[PDB]
Chains A and B, each alone.
Chain A
Amino acid sequence: IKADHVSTYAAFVQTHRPTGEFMFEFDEDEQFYVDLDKKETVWHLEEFGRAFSFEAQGGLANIAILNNNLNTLIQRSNHTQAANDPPEVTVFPKEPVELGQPNTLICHIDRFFPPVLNVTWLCNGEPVTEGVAESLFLPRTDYSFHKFHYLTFVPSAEDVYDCRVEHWGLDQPLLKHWEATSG
């Protein structure tokens, strides 16, 4: 379809966690989502929250409708469960790597299904469990998913990082290696 811009409400439900997600994207960037537990709208950028508002009830109402149609489609499909599509993992920095200058390592997990995932940052083999940001399970036009994980770090020559990814389509955990000299 010819389009200058594409604005999409995307939502899904499933048996395993996360059981529901409701978000809106503009030109493939998540602009806001409805936190289903807090029952409130979360804006990706603060400027969006100052300019816009969205009734969180609209997202909860559509999630319930999605759960209704899920039960109906489970029975109609004769309990058809789709195959596991394993994820593609890439790790790269946000900024040019300068030793001593704060940076953000990005782990991008792509083309996977179902949206069930464990991701862990390893710094010199040790998990980083705090101060780590992550995106929603982001939709793709082929109805698989992708996702971003973020790690603040200071580059140094001796350090080694790993994005450890677990998915049902993988025989073993997937480890994408990265270091300051990685191209």
Chain B
Amino acid sequence: PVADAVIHASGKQMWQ
């Protein structure tokens, strides 16, 4: 529901 939405920064991780 927002006109101008911000993208969110997520990182990679060490493999399982």
Contact = CB atoms under 8 A, between A and B. Distances in A.
Given A62-B8, A65-B8, 10 more contacts: A32-B12, A49-B15, A53-B12, A53-B15, A54-B12, A65-B7, A66-B7, A68-B2, A69-B4, A72-B3
Interface residues of B, number: 14
A69 B5 CA distance: 7
A122 to B, nearest CB: 39
Which residue, of B6, B8, B12, B16, has the highest number of chain A Cβ atoms within 10 A? B12
Interface in A44-58: 49-55, 58
B2 to A, nearest CB: 7
A117 to B, nearest CB: 25
Interface residues of A, number: 19
Interface of A: 9, 11, 24, 32, 49-55, 58, 61-62, 65-66, 68-69, 72
Contacts of B14: 51-53
A9 B7 CA distance: 11
Contacts, number: 39
B5 to A, nearest CB: 5
Contacts of B8: 58, 61-62, 65
A11 B8 CA distance: 12
B15 A52 contact: yes
18 contacts: A11-B7, A49-B15, A50-B15, A51-B14, A51-B15, A52-B13, A52-B14, A53-B12, A53-B14, A54-B12, A58-B8, A61-B8, A62-B7, A65-B7, A68-B2, A68-B5, A69-B3, A69-B4
A54 B10 CA distance: 9
Nearest to A54: B12
A58 B10 contact: yes
